[PDB]
From a paper:
We found that replacement of the pyrimidine with ureas such as 2 increased potency 10-fold, delivering single digit nanomolar inhibitors (IC50 = 7 nM). Protein X-ray crystallography confirmed that the urea moiety interacts in a bidentate hydrogen bond with the Asp101 side chain in [name] (Asp112 in the surrogate kinase MST1). Despite this increase in potency, selectivity toward ROCK2 remained a challenge. Ureas synthesized from cyclic amines, which reduced overall H-bond donors by one (not shown), also displayed more than a 10-fold decrease in activity, highlighting the importance of the two hydrogen bonds for overall potency.
Author numbering: 8 to 26, 29 to 36, 39 to 159, 175 to 295
Amino acid sequence: IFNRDPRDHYDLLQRLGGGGEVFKARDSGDLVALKMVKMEPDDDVSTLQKEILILKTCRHANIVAYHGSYLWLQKLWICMEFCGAGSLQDIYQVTGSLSELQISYVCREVLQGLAYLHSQKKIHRDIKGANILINDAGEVRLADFGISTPYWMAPEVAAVALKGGYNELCDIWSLGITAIELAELQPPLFDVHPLRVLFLMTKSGYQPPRLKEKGKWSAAFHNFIKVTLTKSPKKRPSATKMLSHQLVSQPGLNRGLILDLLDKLKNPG
Ligand SMILES: Cc1nonc1CNC(=O)c1c[nH]c2nccc(Oc3c(F)cc(NC(=O)NCCCN4CCOCC4)cc3F)c12
């Protein structure tokens, strides 16, 4: 970490989104994104610096690269890879749905980042359209919206309360949902209240979900979904195993497909 105003280092060009806040900035002259975070009177910096460590030993082209953090006047700024098309979700919300082939290259890329994260025995915890970033070159980058009364709780409740039951494999499942999300503009049950959906998922009966249209997608896309969305984590394939899958290993898959999508985003019709 460095402790200073980062307005010395970079020029703040423009504001991209709220949450904390993210800004396009320039260093070197090269373009970075600055995630700003307002910390309260209760917030202790000692703990965020253990999560900041985990971000500096994340080197992967399929991972939004972390460049170095800054503490300044009750504000924490994270410098970061700039992906100037935003997220897949800001993209389909304009372009409509993605093609099977587009969706397939996105899925191979995510798996590439995942496999490396699981390599490092980390877990993304939050795979979705909103956390997959697209540079002006149509390359794909998993971003970190996530990792970026206990006194009375017992140790078992405490443990489960940091870790969740998150297993590296729940990242796979989530990708499955993300593919459907990208196919159909919405994940399963977006028009169903979220508690109900959490309950529905735990009955001994719950069938994993699937694409609505059947004709419109290859048998390989169908298998991809069937196999990623296995209920049992013992039986769900690893990300290195999923990179074998025929949906993500077929020829033709390259940034060109997404370049198409970025044009589609400028010139509709
Ligand atoms: C992961 C993430 N998601 O959002 N913010 C983050 C954290 N940023 C990053 O890690 C980034 C790292 N590098 C970046 N380079 C460019 C942008 C980046 O962040 C983004 C950002 F700042 C803004 C947006 N888009 C946005 O806010 N859109 C408004 C959508 C409004 N919807 C609401 C629902 O109803 C429909 C309309 C995307 C980013 F990816 C990053």
